Design a protein around this ligand. Structure first.
Ligand SMILES: [Br-]
Lengths: 146, 144
């Protein structure tokens, strides 16, 4: 199915209230990852980072590399996804704009699928995602399946 | 519509890995707030406490209406103020004050952009049973 991923940039007023600028992106729920909603603070995982505690229920955003960069990977992208969940991601967003074989890897379906959205994302939405993801200290990802 | 609220009790292990214990509950989406999903770590507000890290799930447990005759805030106000303070959904427990529910579901006001879930009877009982035990719990709030 299709994921409607909203990305929130939040900034607190001096008296303790918050202001937002949200941004609405689109990916795809994968065969491997459950098709539910979610939400949490985004940690930007280096793809090699999955081979440092975080509080629980955060949303990993890995951008996958040009495939010749990792000839013998530490893990299959699916491995990377299920390890993040062990490490306590509530969710998972992959940028595949560099590795569209991820899509086959991810949509296998052979295994029992994760209980959590593993969502992939490419082209321009991946751009606007990283655009914002690098900008400020904390950004909260809302994922829905409306 | 029925709010599927699911409550994680997380425990850190040797690896850095976590082990869970989900508790599967139910409520209603109120009309004061959007009918969508949400999650975040559960912060317990005292009802008079409306008078954090952005993205938290306020849980109020409302009380006998004769305990606070002149409220500093409507229950609607309470839900809106929590959203002002970065709440990303807001779950009340109307068990003791069932007139709140009318006030929430008036519809004169234009709705919040957040789940405003209410709850009662048994399912809140489990809910509060869990909030009071742990320090921190995730409220996944699921719109199916
Ligand atoms: Br692997």
């Amino acid at each position: 199915e299709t994921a409607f991923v909203e990305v929130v940039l939040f900034e607190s007023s001096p008296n303790g209230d918050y202001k937002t600028h949200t941004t609405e992106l689109q990916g795809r729920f994968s065969r491997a990852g459950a098709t539910i909603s979610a939400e949490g603070e985004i940690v930007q995982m280096h793809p090699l980072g999955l081979c440092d505690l975080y509080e629980y229920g955060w949303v990993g955003v890995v951008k996958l590399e040009q495939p010749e960069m990792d000839p013998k990977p530490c893990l299959t992208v699916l491995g990377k996804a299920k390890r993040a969940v062990q490490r306590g991601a509530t969710a998972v967003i992959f940028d595949v704009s560099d590795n569209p074989d991820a899509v086959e890897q991810l949509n296998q379906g052979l295994e029992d699928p994760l209980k959590r959205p593993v969502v992939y994302m490419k082209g321009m939405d991946a751009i606007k995602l990283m655009n914002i993801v690098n900008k400020q200290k904390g950004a909260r990802a809302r994922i829905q399946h409306r």
